[PDB]
């Protein structure tokens, strides 16, 4: 039963009625060999094999 | 043949390093001694 | 002679920081550096008009540049040129991270 008002689906970027743009991730601040330098970021590849940060882009081409 | 330094380097000092090895070696010989100090400098830190 | 010095002059000779100390040298006797440049140029024009195939994967700068410090006395390949003795086989790129 569902009243009127009430979330019946979900859209994109929304989990459970509220807005998420992003992950959660496990991090240390601490300097690394000077992969970090100025404003750089070292990842781990968990990331890239279970497709943390993946994302689909669709474009149009037409005539 | 070089000061031995017993107290510490901040960035004042490091220029004044640089600037000195610079006239008395030349920019050849001080570029190699960068390379080497920015190793040990990544590595300690 | 100081005991551990061996990864690093093999580093200095395979980088190509041999050809950065030799420019020095060879400045160092000059007082236009716009001239000297003007000079190298031409004879790498003299050396590929003549012998036009050799080139190409010889530079013909570093060429002049090798030849010069022969004469000196300083022991230098040809070009500067180095073979990687211990490639897998045809085919195959070293990662130079």
């Not at chain 1, 000077?34 to 781990?44: F, T």
């Not at chain 2, 220029?15 to 300690?44: C, E, N, P």
């Not at chain 3, 004879?43 to 410090?69: C, F, T």
Request: charge should be negative.
């Amino acid at each position: 039963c569902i009243k009127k008002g009430q979330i019946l689906a979900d859209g994109a970027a929304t989990v459970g009625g509220e807005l998420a743009l992003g992950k959660n991730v496990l991090v240390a601040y601490m300097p690394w060999e000077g992969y970090n330098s100025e404003d750089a970021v070292l990842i781990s590849e968990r990331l890239v094999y279970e497709d943390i940060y993946t994302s689909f882009h669709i474009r149009k081409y037409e005539i | 043949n070089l000061v031995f330094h017993n107290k510490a380097i901040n960035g004042t000092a490091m220029k004044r390093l640089i600037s000195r090895l610079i006239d008395h070696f030349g920019m050849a010989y001080t570029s190699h001694i960068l390379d080497q100090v920015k190793t040990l400098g990544f590595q300690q830190a | 002679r100081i005991p551990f010095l061996e990864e690093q002059v093999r580093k200095i000779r395979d980088g190509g920081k041999l050809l950065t100390m030799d420019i020095h040298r060879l400045l160092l006797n000059e007082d236009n550096r716009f001239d000297f440049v003007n000079e190298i140029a031409a004879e790498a024009k003299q050396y590929v008009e003549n012998n036009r195939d050799e080139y190409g994967a010889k530079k013909a700068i570093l060429h002049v540049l090798s030849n010069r410090m022969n004469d000196a006395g300083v022991y230098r390949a040809e070009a500067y040129m180095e073979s990687d003795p211990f490639k897998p086989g045809p085919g195959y790129l070293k990662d130079e991270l």
